[PDB]
Amino acid sequence: NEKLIALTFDDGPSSTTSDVLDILERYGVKATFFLIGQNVNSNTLSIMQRQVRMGCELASHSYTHQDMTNMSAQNIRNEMEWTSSAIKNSVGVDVKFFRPPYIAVNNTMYQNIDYPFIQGTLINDSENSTSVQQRVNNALGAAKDGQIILLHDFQGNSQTVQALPQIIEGLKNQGYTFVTVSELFEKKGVNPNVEYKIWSNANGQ
Ligand SMILES: [Co+2]
C-alpha cells in the first residue's frame, strides 16, 4: 500500500540547488534533478557530486534550455547527446529521463529523443509572484499515488527553498514515500520507455 511521490527539480544545478539538497538531506528524501547541460561545469561539479552521493537522480533538461519545437532534428539530437555525456563524464551517472524545456514538445522532438518524456504537475514556482505558501499548497494539492511533481532550482528561486520543508513534512504526514523517477517506475513495475508519450504519473493516464 506504498504511496509514491516523485519530487523533481528543473533548471539546475545552481547555488540554490545546494539549499534544496540541505533540506532533502535533513528529511532523508531523494529527488530527481533535470539538469541544463550548459550548467554542468567546474562551477557546479561539487553540487552534482553531492547529488550523486545523496542518491538523487540526474536527468536531462536539454543543453541550452531553448524551445526545442523551433529546432532541427540534428540540433535536438546534439543537445541530448551533449547533455547526457556531460553528466556521464562529470559524475559517472547515466541519464534515464528527459523533460522538455517549457514543456514545449512537437513531433520532431518525439522522433529524435530516445529517452522517456516527463512532464508532471506544475506548481508555478517559476514566477516570484507565486508565494511560498501558494507553492506549498500547490504541491500538497497535486500529490497522489504515483505522481511526478515539477519544481525549479534555478539560481535565486529561494521561495521554493522556503516552501520545501512544509511540502516534505506534509506529504509524509499524508503517508507518501519519496522516490526518484527511476525508482517510481521500477517500484510500480511500469516500463517508462514508451515512444511518443509524456508521463506525469507512473499510471500513464
Ligand atoms: Co526549465
Author numbering: 583 to 787
What did the authors write?
Xyl-CE4 at a concentration of 10 mg/mL in 20 mM Tris pH 7.5, 10 mM NaCl was crystallised in 8% (w/v) PEG 4000. The Xyl-CE4 domain encompasses 201 amino acid residues folded into eight α-helices, four β-strands and several extended loops that together create a distorted (α/β)-fold in which the β-strands form a curved inner β-sheet surrounded by the α-helices. The electron density of Xyl-CE4 reveals a metal ion bound through a distorted octahedral coordination by His643, His647, Asp593, a water molecule and an acetate ion. A single metal binding site identified in the crystal structure of Xyl-CE4 was correspondingly interpreted as Co2+ without further corroboration. EDTA treatment reduced enzyme activity to 0% of the untreated sample (0.2 μg Xyl-CE4 in 50 mM Tris pH 8.0). Addition of 10 mM Co2+, Mg2+ and Cu2+ restored the enzyme activity to 133, 122 and 110% of the original activity, respectively. Zn2+, the optimal ion for most CE4 enzymes, decreased the activity of Xyl-CE4 emphasizing the importance of identifying the optimal metal ions for each metalloenzyme. The esterase activity of Xyl-CE4 was investigated spectrophotometrically by monitoring the release of para-nitrophenol (p-NP) from 200 μL of 0.5 mM p-NPA at 405 nm and 30°C. Xyl-CE4 was active between pH 6.5 and 8.5 with maximum activity at pH 7.5. Catalytic activity of Xyl-CE4 between 20 and 80°C indicated a temperature optimum of 45°C. CD spectra recorded between 20 and 80°C yielded a melting temperature of 56°C.
